[PDB]
């Protein structure tokens, strides 16, 4: 079990328990554990020895009904802070999870629309005053009012409905403390006024919201906090010039769409540091990209760009160039100007040869420079040796 230990995207020590009869005492003996994964553990009774798990902060009860008693309850109320309960039944949801004081991250997966239990089982969310993250992958048709009273202290609300329109009715105006409204697969096809009515959202990711025309972006300039407006996975067919109003944007991820072209006025946001346009229908890449001096990773993979403008290389802060699978005729030698470039995707394309100026980039290495073997071999032997030596060490 000790060599079984692993780490997550949060770089927190986990361990995945998967078809276990219960929790072994050897599991609870571990004291460095951060995330305990009770997944598909049939009706396991949690013993008080969970107090040995001093570092325990994350529990993901995936189809695992947890039977608990008073001392383990006290230890979890005083220690545990994040809890991602995945269930397929109301009985699978334990009633003690609403009694935890220090809980701040709570994730639900599984349909919640039921008879005489719609938004009543979660009435204990008022007891939980430390809740800040509330993910509901529950295919719900409307946001519950108990969650609205919780939203006074809630800072993050992510809804996953799997293609079900959520009845907004501007009912999210109560959660003035909301900071990251990530409507995942909500299939809204419009932006309600509650999204730009609250003033506290920095990151608004409308993932698979199916918005045809991105027209409510003028009202987002009052959102001084807004710096991450990820409008990916939509039928946006054209970008109106009005987005030039929003100058505070940094992480504009506009990928996997049918954008015919990003205009010059889109580059009017000089604060843009991370720009994703991958899997799009761009005609080309304009010159006003030279304005975005803060750009670090520009991603136009599998889009339609025939020639790389020198204004792209005029910026020096580029770090991750997702330029693969394109119709780039050739890569200009001006890439030798780029120093921050630590990785560049050049596989596929119509790339005739790689210029020797790629060796001028210090941070770039073999793992960074992903390209076909023959095209890499087109480079002179000694610069390839230099790149190899800088890679392996």
């Amino acid at each position: 079990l000790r060599q079984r230990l692993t780490k997550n995207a949060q770089d927190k020590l986990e361990l995945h328990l998967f078809m276990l009869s219960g929790i072994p005492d050897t599991v609870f003996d571990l004291v460095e554990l951060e995330v305990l994964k009770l997944e598909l553990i049939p009706d396991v009774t949690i013993p008080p020895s969970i107090a040995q798990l001093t570092g325990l902060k994350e529990l993901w009860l995936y189809h695992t009904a947890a039977k608990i008693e008073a001392p383990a309850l006290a230890f979890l109320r005083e220690n545990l802070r994040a809890l991602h309960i995945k269930f397929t039944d109301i009985k699978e949801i334990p009633l003690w999870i609403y009694s935890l004081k220090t809980l701040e991250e709570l994730h639900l997966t599984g349909n919640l629309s039921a008879e005489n239990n719609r938004y009543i089982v979660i009435d204990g969310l008022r007891e939980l005053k430390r809740l800040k993250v509330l993910r509901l992958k529950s295919n719900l048709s409307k946001l519950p009012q108990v969650v609205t009273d919780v939203g006074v202290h809630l800072q993050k609300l992510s809804i996953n409905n799997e293609g079900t329109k959520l009845i907004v009715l501007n009912s999210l105006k109560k959660m003035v403390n909301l900071t990251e409204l990530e409507l995942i697969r909500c299939d809204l096809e419009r932006i309600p006024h509650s999204i730009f009515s609250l003033h506290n959202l920095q990151e608004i990711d409308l993932k698979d919201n199916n918005l045809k025309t991105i027209e409510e972006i003028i009202s987002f300039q009052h959102l001084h906090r807004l710096t991450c407006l990820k409008l990916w996975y939509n039928h946006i067919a054209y970008i109106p010039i009005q987005i030039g109003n929003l100058t505070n944007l940094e992480r504009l991820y506009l990928n996997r769409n049918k954008i015919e072209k990003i205009p010059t006025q889109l580059f009017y946001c000089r604060k843009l540091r991370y720009l994703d346009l991958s899997h799009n229908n761009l005609t080309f890449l304009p010159a006003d990209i030279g304005l975005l001096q803060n750009l670090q990773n520009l991603a136009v993979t599998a889009n339609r760009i025939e020639a790389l403008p020198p204004e792209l290389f005029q910026c020096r802060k580029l770090r991750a160039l997702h330029l693969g699978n394109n119709v780039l005729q050739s890569l200009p030698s001006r890439v030798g100007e780029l120093t921050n470039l630590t990785q560049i995707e050049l596989r596929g394309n119509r790339l005739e040869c790689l210029p020797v100026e790629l060796g001028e980039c210090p941070l770039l290495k073999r793992s960074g420079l992903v390209v076909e073997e023959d095209l890499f071999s087109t480079l002179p032997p000694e610069v390839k040796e230099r790149l190899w030596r800088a890679d392996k060490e």
């Binding site: 692993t6 995945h16 998967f18 993979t301 693969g324 699978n325 030698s333 995707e345 596989r347 596929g348 005739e352 040869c353 210029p355 020797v356 100026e357 060796g359 992903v370 076909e372 002179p380 032997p381 000694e382 610069v383 230099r386």
Partner: protein, 396 residues
């Protein structure tokens, strides 16, 4: 046996920048594999007696499938979904039945990698001539001992664009099936034992490139009709046996890429370098006696490889052409590097490895894009720069 965490460990990338799961010599396909929905490519190697359930409908992100030496079975929902979603396929048919018959019920398929082998009765493979159901197929690479091009390709010529065939010593015949190519753009024939370029290639009016790899082209006399390939920019006739180059090269000037490496050419004519649009010219590991001065006509050249030649004389007109980005003259019979070499401003690559040189001139500093890596030479030639030139060169 295979937990999802083990599959996370197995997760990797492939030659097409997709999320690949390499599954090697497995008893079957687990449903835990299909539980992963972020997957972009599946690699199944010699996993035979395998039936694809409806559960692959979980993972929508698939674009590539590697069905290697494995007899696979199918289910109706799997047919529907892989008709709707799958586009890239790479199968290996070590046995003819290890090729499954259901690849051809799809339509969205675009890339196909038909690596393996074939028998004498080539035309009897009805598995090939069902790609009429494929509408989006654009890449076809058949590494097999195929002697006759099937009528399959004849049918699918309307939408097919790329050919890559490795016969490996097998003679390719029946070239009318390649005549009735119409919309094809790329043709890479390797070891097809084609003695002469057929009228099939000239029947193609939209061929972007041609490869006659490992094909015994003793003479090139059918180039007269090569003018019909206006899209032809690439002529990679390398490791070939072209003994001399005639005037017929004047038929096409849209030619850009020109690989005659390891060719039998003795003397270049006055008639190659008339086609000024050529930028990419290769004569690597040939045995040319000398370079005539008509090379001065090729100004838009950006690559001139004649490495390992017997060339004792480089006239200064190739040094006069400044647009020449790459210029490989390695292991020739030349004597002295040109002192007036700094005039070439856009000279990115000068492979002159193994040439019998004496002393490098000081004007390498005037060269803007020539490095020690670019000017690959023996080290006793590297040691020759003046001390101030070393100070200016170590700082480039």
């Amino acid at each position: 046996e295979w937990t999802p965490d083990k599959l996370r460990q197995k997760l990797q990338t492939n030659a097409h920048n997709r999320l690949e799961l390499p599954l090697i010599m497995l008893s079957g396909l687990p449903d835990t594999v299909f539980e992963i929905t972020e997957l972009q490519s599946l690699k199944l190697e010699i996993i035979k007696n395998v039936m694809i359930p409806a559960t692959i409908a979980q993972l929508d992100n698939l674009q590539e499938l590697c069905l290697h030496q494995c007899s696979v079975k199918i289910h109706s929902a799997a047919l529907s979904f892989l008709k709707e979603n799958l586009k890239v396929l790479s199968v290996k048919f070590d046995d003819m039945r290890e090729l499954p018959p259901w690849m051809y019920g799809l339509r969205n398929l675009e890339e196909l990698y038909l690596v393996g082998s074939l028998s004498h009765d080539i035309s009897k493979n009805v598995t090939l001539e069902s790609l009429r159901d494929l509408k989006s197929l654009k890449i076809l690479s058949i590494k097999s001992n195929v002697s006759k091009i099937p009528q399959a390709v004849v049918d699918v010529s309307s939408h097919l664009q790329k050919m890559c065939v490795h016969n490996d010593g097998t003679k390719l015949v029946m070239l009318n099936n390649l005549k009735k190519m119409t919309n094809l753009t790329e043709l890479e024939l390797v070891h097809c034992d084609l003695e002469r370029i057929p009228h099939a290639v000239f029947s193609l009016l939209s061929l972007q490139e041609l490869d006659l790899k490992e094909n015994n082209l003793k003479s090139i006399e059918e180039i007269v009709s090569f003018q019909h390939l206006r899209k032809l920019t690439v002529l990679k006739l390398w490791y070939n046996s072209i003994a001399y180059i005639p005037e017929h090269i004047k038929k096409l000037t849209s030619l850009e890429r020109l690989f005659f490496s390891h060719n039998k050419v003795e003397v270049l004519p006055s008639h190659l370098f008339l086609c000024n649009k050529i930028r990419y010219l290769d004569l690597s590991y040939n045995d040319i006696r000398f370079i005539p001065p008509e090379i001065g006509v090729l100004q838009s050249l950006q690559y001139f490889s004649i490495t390992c030649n017997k060339v004792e004389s480089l006239p200064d007109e190739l040094y006069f052409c400044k647009k020449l980005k790459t210029l490989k003259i390695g292991k020739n019979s030349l004597s002295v590097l040109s002192p007036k070499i700094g005039n070439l401003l856009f000279l990115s690559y000068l492979d002159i490895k193994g040439n019998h040189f004496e002393v490098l001139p000081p004007e390498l500093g005037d060269c803007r894009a020539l490095k020690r890596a670019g000017l690959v030479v023996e080290d006793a030639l590297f040691e020759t720069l003046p001390s101030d030139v070393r100070e200016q060169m170590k700082a480039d």
